[PDB]
Write a protein that binds this DNA or RNA. Sequence first.
DNA 1: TTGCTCTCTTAAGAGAGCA
DNA 2: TTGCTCTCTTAAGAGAGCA
Lengths: 370, 374, 374, 370
Amino acid sequence: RFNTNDETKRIVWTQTAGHCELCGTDLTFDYRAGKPMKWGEVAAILPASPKGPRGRADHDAEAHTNDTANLMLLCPGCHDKIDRDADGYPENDLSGLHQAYLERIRLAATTPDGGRAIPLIVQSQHFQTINDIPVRDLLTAMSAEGLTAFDQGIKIAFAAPGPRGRDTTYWQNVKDSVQYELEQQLKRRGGTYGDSPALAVVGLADIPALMMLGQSIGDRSKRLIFSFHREHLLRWPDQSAEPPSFLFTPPPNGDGPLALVLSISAQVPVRDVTDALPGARIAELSIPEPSYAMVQNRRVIHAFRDALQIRLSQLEALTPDPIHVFAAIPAALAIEFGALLTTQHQHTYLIFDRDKENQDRFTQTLQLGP
Amino acid sequence: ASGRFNTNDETKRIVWTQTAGHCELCGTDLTFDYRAGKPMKWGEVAAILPASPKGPRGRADHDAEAHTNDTANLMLLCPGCHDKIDRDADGYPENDLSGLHQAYLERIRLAATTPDGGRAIPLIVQSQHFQTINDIPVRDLLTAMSAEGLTAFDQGIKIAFAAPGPRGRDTTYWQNVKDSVQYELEQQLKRRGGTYGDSPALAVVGLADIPALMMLGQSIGDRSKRLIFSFHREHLLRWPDQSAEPPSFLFTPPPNGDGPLALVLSISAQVPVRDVTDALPGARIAELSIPEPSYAMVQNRRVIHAFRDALQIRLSQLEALTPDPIHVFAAIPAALAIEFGALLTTQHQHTYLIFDRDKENQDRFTQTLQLGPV
Amino acid sequence: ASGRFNTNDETKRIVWTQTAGHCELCGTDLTFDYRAGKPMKWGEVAAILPASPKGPRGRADHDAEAHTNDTANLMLLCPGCHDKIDRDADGYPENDLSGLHQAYLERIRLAATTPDGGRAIPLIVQSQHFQTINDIPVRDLLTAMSAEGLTAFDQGIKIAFAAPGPRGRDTTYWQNVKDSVQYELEQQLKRRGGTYGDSPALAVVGLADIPALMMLGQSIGDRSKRLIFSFHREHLLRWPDQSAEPPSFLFTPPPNGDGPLALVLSISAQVPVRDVTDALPGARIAELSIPEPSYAMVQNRRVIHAFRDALQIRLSQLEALTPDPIHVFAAIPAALAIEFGALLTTQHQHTYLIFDRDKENQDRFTQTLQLGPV
Amino acid sequence: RFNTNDETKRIVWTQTAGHCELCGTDLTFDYRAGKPMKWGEVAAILPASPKGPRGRADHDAEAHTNDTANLMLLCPGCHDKIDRDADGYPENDLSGLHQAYLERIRLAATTPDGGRAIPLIVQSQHFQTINDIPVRDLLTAMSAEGLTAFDQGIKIAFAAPGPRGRDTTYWQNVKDSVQYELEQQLKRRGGTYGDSPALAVVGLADIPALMMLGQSIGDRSKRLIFSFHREHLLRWPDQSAEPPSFLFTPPPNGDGPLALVLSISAQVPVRDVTDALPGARIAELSIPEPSYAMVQNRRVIHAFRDALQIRLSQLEALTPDPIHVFAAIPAALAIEFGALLTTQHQHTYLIFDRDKENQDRFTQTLQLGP
DNA sequence: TTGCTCTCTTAAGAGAGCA
DNA sequence: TTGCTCTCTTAAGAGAGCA
Ligand SMILES: Nc1ncnc2c1ncn2[C@@H]1O[C@@H]2COP(=O)(O)O[C@@H]3[C@H](O)[C@@H](COP(=O)(O)O[C@H]2[C@H]1O)O[C@H]3n1cnc2c(N)ncnc21
Ligand SMILES: Nc1ncnc2c1ncn2[C@@H]1O[C@@H]2COP(=O)(O)O[C@@H]3[C@H](O)[C@@H](COP(=O)(O)O[C@H]2[C@H]1O)O[C@H]3n1cnc2c(N)ncnc21
Ligand SMILES: Nc1ncnc2c1ncn2[C@@H]1O[C@@H]2COP(=O)(O)O[C@@H]3[C@H](O)[C@@H](COP(=O)(O)O[C@H]2[C@H]1O)O[C@H]3n1cnc2c(N)ncnc21
Ligand SMILES: Nc1ncnc2c1ncn2[C@@H]1O[C@@H]2COP(=O)(O)O[C@@H]3[C@H](O)[C@@H](COP(=O)(O)O[C@H]2[C@H]1O)O[C@H]3n1cnc2c(N)ncnc21
Ligand SMILES: [Zn+2]
Ligand SMILES: [Zn+2]
Ligand SMILES: [Zn+2]
Ligand SMILES: [Zn+2]
């Protein structure tokens, strides 16, 4: 009268795919000694007797015996803990975690196949804080779009700056990581992924480095860009958001050096460009409200790309000398920027960045080009 | 076409579980009957099919029975999809579906293992004063973490900022604060785990003077899996309301002139201008406020994120106007002070001078902290 | 001296468990009575004492009751040691023992958590031929791993070396072998875990031609937590005898001359010299053997380690004699071929030319692999 | 008649310190929600009925009901698995793991306090294989000698060589890791460890780098050297082994450059020294049977140190020009070698190493000195 | 040759009486 | 004011009869 029947336990195992709803462990197999076994327990949130953990007098136990909204698949340890600390694992909290777990499974089961890609994380250590993109979050963002991979992918972390800051040694190391380490790790995959597998790539690293990354993978391989967002991590903030307008101001005439100022994350003060590059003729690409949060979805990235491609060809047509780049842009845009410099734009680009060893002044770092 | 693949009931249960009970080609939930109060006829609402052929036609180019012996190579399909799969007379597909099937299984597994992505470090940071009058026990953070899917696996970190000596909150004092936090944080983020070896998430709450909270933000940054929690006078560590929409952050630009630039943040309460100009003579005041300032305004974490997004938009505008330092007079909740410090951790740095209210001098605004190019 | 500290029975149980039932000052096992068939008088054979004083004399300079409230700050002592601890009238020590007590607890915890240091990756590597005639199922490695404290947490890796095409086992072939192993190995060693975030141990067994086994050794190296397992014709993956002492590795130096230098390893069987000189005309033979060559000689893992130690001592002597390549003719078990390849992974590299017996050409010795400066 | 009594369950919890004998998890506390709870199970290896897992007709269940040799403390998941796969978890294997677990606890409980130290792991990536010293194994070797720490310590991993091999950039990076990263991480500890805490240090890294490490920590701090061993990992192979004899051959007279050849791990061929340093006058320190396995215990390291200190002063007395070092030595000896070069020996030492980019020839790398 | 039921097994926390 | 016993609770795998 109180016992959950076999059909329902089957349903509970099915709808959870046989993992513990609270810790995620696989409950269909013992990896230690190698035997398939169903070592999980079907657990009641609200108990039969009102004197059990989370018990209530107003709970019709008979009416809810085979109510899968009351039943979780738990490993025996999780189940033992939740029944020993009802105040710490209350009904509202368990039911909410239960429902959310089930919905993530249902959405994965209804996502159509969208192909395969190599996950690629590239991150620096030039910040004074930890900088770490979780692998699970990239793979989960891939999976929400139907994309899967044969392994957890490549994760490259640049060496930190040494005692002299971002000196020539540092930039040599950045280069070696992008142009040697990355390539050696793509080759070690062999044919696992094929001839030209796609790269599902997310960066959070020096702006010059990310532009170099972009240039290196631009034609080399097909690319699916993802983005780290302060609020939403690897999830796109809002798939329905419309891209902003990319405003452009052309440079003035003259012989002075040509500068391309990109004010997307923030407004780059012109005083800081003329300090670093006296006599500069400034061209500027910006959005109406510069913001760190603006990479709302992948169409924002493409629209940036489409807008900048147009203007780069224009700017190259003006001078034979390098274009000097001063950029306050999100990391995903930095990668797309470099991917445009592959062959479409074979002019020399000298990339300035903020220099903590020179009181936040812009200084020259990397040169991108033919 | 033609044949059907024989399975026993143990194999059915295993296939139904690894696929979560949906057709691998169209995604229909095959537990519909049970949800409708009808008995599950498990063998009638689904077909089980090996994912790979035996070989050319139905001619084993390999040990086909040794591959289908693995339940991992068996698919679940609704009958309509099964009927569109041409097969030989033993039930094996004529064409290979192994790629699509293994991709389906990976997507279910990544969803089923998502709870282990909650592995977390608890971190409570208080000033000696709030530790005495308003101690936050680790238990209170853990149950708030747990309700959100965050799971600690070792003791939590609870730090109390030492009070200052005679030198005051000087540069050495703030550097030892930062080192103390990053030391504990780094040792616990070496404790990787889960399915992919990811570093644990950080679950952090603070209650201290606003400049110390900003230094906690400086220490943790905003480029890692981190979740701020918030102490609330009425709801303690539980969010007052997960459905509340963030307020509008109103902004009043500074008047024009050469006086020092002040950023007044009137979020907890309305800061009077005379208190600002007493401490900073000639100040030119810019103000970020909300329509109804309130100590209780942190209804959920989206409010913290929305404050940071509006704050950063206005900081860009202000820094455009002048290279000189920005003098910060903040009436904000503790969670917003943390996120303010964390925002200011990019390579780019502008000078910010943080004014605290001196509880031992009439609550007078007092400069205790400088962030930025030094 | 004087006072005693009151504890209830729940607190006693907690202190007895966190200390494993020994005195924290002298280490005596306080469960002696139970081991002797006598009833445990838990409150008589031990004293429980806070580790830290209340303050000067027995004068709380702090909330002493708030600290002893934590059972983690309570010590277990035998009565004789307790009697040597001068105390105040509430039972608190007069002098601070917190450091010694917390160090004791850490040592017990590091021992109690030692099972999680067994986290492991299973790896089975075979040639297509041995996979067909002598497949090693993952289950057999797992139960041998488990019996030794090694615990896998995901599916094991089982690799089969592709057979060579018309180009033979050329440089490209051996590089793809190495890449294939290091690819799988690296992805699974990213899966850190346990108490400290350590990478998992590797548990590896191989059955393939000796040159391929040496390349597996080249791929895994010998500078990480790795445990070789061994297939044995009679004991399968279980060690025949954990108490067996390794045999003596006998060595016969090469005669003097200018002929090519050959290293003959007669461990599984005695290699006839004419087989060596057929393949390598003019060879100058050095030989490492054991007294009674036998296919069954890998009784335990110490035998593998002892072979490597004797082998390396003799390789140093041989390489001293000539800069020219060393030509290797090995009759050794599979586990010894793996460890031989792993030995040769330092920065220093001498040229080694490995001869295999061609099963499709009368078992003729044939050079298939070159290791070293290329 | 069959039930384990409360005294014995108490004994089982006590002697295991309340952790799962098979997975090591803490069974006295729920870290997720914060409540102390005893969530483990006292488990029988041989069961009551002979029809249970590992059952046997010849097992007197009544005689062994409170036999702690038959009872393990297990988490509920481990206990559920071992009872579902008796063939995979047989009596002999469980009993052996049980006994070993208990003995590790007893030895930790009887180890006297031996002070505190900062664990320090330093490892390179210049090998073509993974190179990774487990933290647990250093902390366990420390604990066997009574030493404990407040944290798991410092673990530095040098950047890998880039595409040019061990070039000037590589060696700059090694320097920065030893002289900047290490120091910044010792300072971040603050007063946690005191003014001059000791370093419990183990290296596995380039010989030149380890000598630089040694020179940097030699006087800076008190040092407890540990060693990675191919067979025994961080455990000392044999605490009763006697040190070998360190044989010395003095250099010949002449004006040629002075070389110090160290043949400890292996015999360094003289042909390789005269190739790199024509006209070299070779002095040699060696043991009678060079071997990778020779670091049997810490007295072997001290005896090497004592023998080399004597000879370095002699060699410095011979020339005013640098001493050129060609060394095939274990990693722990490389660290002790450098620690002697702090002030006792203020002559210039030029360190040669094997060069994979020059066909295994010795080439000059780092210069150690005043 | 399941594939629903009711008994059985194994662990544990109360509850009573007593210590 | 434990601090040994026997009942109670919750999960599960057989075992029987039948489907
Ligand atoms: N006057 C000016 N005002 C403001 N910024 C200015 C400037 N002049 C230059 N800049 C630079 O523009 C970049 C804006 O920051 P961003 O976040 O929009 O983009 C960054 C960038 O693409 C890359 C490297 O960061 P950094 O080197 O600090 O460069 C900063 C900053 O110095 O990683 C992105 N990034 C950093 N931290 C992140 C996080 N937590 N989450 C997500 N993406 C993050
Ligand atoms: N004109 C002005 N009028 C009103 N305030 C003004 C001001 N000009 C500046 N301020 C400052 O704005 C902060 C508002 O108070 P708050 O409560 O919203 O946020 C505080 C703050 O973030 C941090 C340190 O407190 P304090 O130094 O008093 O800072 C005050 C106050 O000095 O901890 C938070 N905090 C304190 N006690 C808390 C509790 N019990 N529960 C939860 N959070 C608590
Ligand atoms: N004059 C000479 N006389 C005898 N052998 C001679 C020789 N000159 C060279 N040799 C080689 O010495 C190896 C001895 O055999 P082994 O069994 O001790 O070790 C083998 C080897 O390590 C690897 C590949 O086998 P193979 O290529 O035949 O190598 C043979 C043989 O060619 O796998 C191991 N292996 C094979 N089958 C196994 C099994 N069933 N169980 C367990 N381990 C097994
Ligand atoms: N003619 C010659 N013959 C043999 N060696 C010669 C030589 N001329 C130079 N040498 C060098 O002497 C060192 C001997 O090896 P070693 O192991 O005794 O000591 C090493 C060393 O101290 C440091 C860097 O290693 P590496 O740069 O390869 O230097 C090698 C080798 O190139 O790490 C130690 N190390 C490496 N791997 C280890 C492991 N798995 N376990 C434990 N410690 C390990
Ligand atoms: Zn669980
Ligand atoms: Zn379908
Ligand atoms: Zn004692
Ligand atoms: Zn366990």
